[PDB]
Design a protein around this ligand. Structure first.
Ligand code: TDC
Ligand code: TDC
Ligand code: CL
Ligand code: CL
Ligand code: CL
Ligand code: CL
Lengths: 202, 202
């Protein structure tokens, strides 16, 4: 097959979706691509390189709300950005796992700079703006992680107390979206309390 | 070596700390234990079983704030519980990854029931209490994930714009704890706004 950047990543995304993060071995990638391993090594040195590139491409493909609308409130931007990030992370098997620990790629610099600048323009110190964005990112990654990994575990592997029993029905009543959106509102409002408080005790 | 539950888990925890979640293969576990693979299979059927058991034991060992103090506020319980959960997840390499997607084990039923009951006693519906606890869990897992995976990536693998440059210094100025604690306060306060609002628009 074609071994340009785009096609290697396509194939790796396919292989990820088919077999998860453990299936992504340079060995199985060579098979999908129809090549020998030294051929693949010329293009792709190791799993880390591959994963870093997949993380960027997952957002290029499916992260459709990466910048604020004109005059958009910071609350609304974080909300829309979070839902977009969640969507993108859920579109491939183990995609959140792929994203973990990545730092912004050079291709993403202008976008992440604008996000950070936008927060400071709305009254946050750089630090407080970053802690908000971070918290949103972290909560969204955890929520997605937990969902994706739960589904995996249900393909592999009775005296419940009553509240737990009900709580289990509730979590499993949708894909996680209800709990995620409730949490996201809580988070955004907590940032707001913090921001508006200025130097007052809060 | 001894192949009781306790010693198998000890060994697997050791192997996890030494080699991360990918190092935990039934094959490498058999070597640490000084046994052949069919011997190990009698005790441990597959990786999933192992991981589920490790997740429970990581909390038994290092999760020291799993229940509310007498008269403790719900805010203070969530705070103390979250910091405890974070500590426990950070005590082994890839321990958050080990915990992902696990549901409460029978050994943990009484504790999780009490957590859920405690929330409802403090004015939450079961559902809203669960969304709070979930959000805390998810945010803590993401935060820990991101930290642990970042450190891994720094063992494997220059025109930064200014805000990103500073933001990178800030994240890397500690182990993640500052951002985590700031986020946690934001989250808890957002739950409070939601709870006290009752049927009022908020
Ligand atoms: C600001 C920032 C971000 C991210 C990030 O990893 C990061 C970092 O590692 C160090 C310092 C700053 C940041 C994101 O992953 C990312 O997901 C991202 O790259 C990103 C994106 N590229 O559009 C986002 O939308 C952000 N959003 C999920 C809060 C977030 C922004
Ligand atoms: C309530 C609950 C919890 C957890 C959980 O996985 C869960 C679930 O999967 C379905 C329904 C309810 C819950 C936790 O993982 C756990 O980490 C947990 O087992 C736990 C523990 N065993 O002590 C905790 O302390 C909790 N805390 C991190 C918010 C949280 C509580
Ligand atoms: Cl071709
Ligand atoms: Cl080619
Ligand atoms: Cl022995
Ligand atoms: Cl034995």
């Amino acid at each position: 097959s074609r071994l340009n950047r785009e096609s290697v990543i396509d194939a790796a995304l396919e292989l990820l979706n088919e077999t998860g993060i453990d299936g992504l071995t340079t060995r199985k990638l060579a098979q999908k691509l129809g090549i020998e391993q030294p051929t693949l090594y010329w293009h792709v040195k190791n799993k880390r390189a591959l994963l870093d590139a997949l993380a960027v491409e997952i957002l290029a493909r499916h992260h459709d709300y990466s910048l604020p609308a004109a005059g958009e409130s910071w609350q609304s931007f974080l909300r829309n950005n979070a839902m977009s990030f969640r969507r993108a992370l859920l579109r491939y098997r183990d995609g959140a796992k792929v994203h973990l620990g990545t730092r912004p790629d050079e291709k993403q610099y202008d976008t992440v700079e604008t996000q950070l600048r936008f927060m400071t323009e709305n009254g946050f110190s750089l630090r407080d703006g970053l802690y908000a964005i971070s918290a949103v990112s972290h909560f969204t990654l955890g929520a997605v992680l937990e969902q994706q990994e739960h589904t995996a575990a249900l393909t592999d592997r009775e005296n419940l107390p009553p509240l737990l029993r009900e709580a289990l029905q509730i979590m499993d009543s949708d894909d996680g979206e209800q709990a995620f959106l409730h949490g996201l509102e809580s988070l955004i409002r907590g940032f707001e309390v913090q921001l508006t408080a200025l130097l007052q005790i809060v």
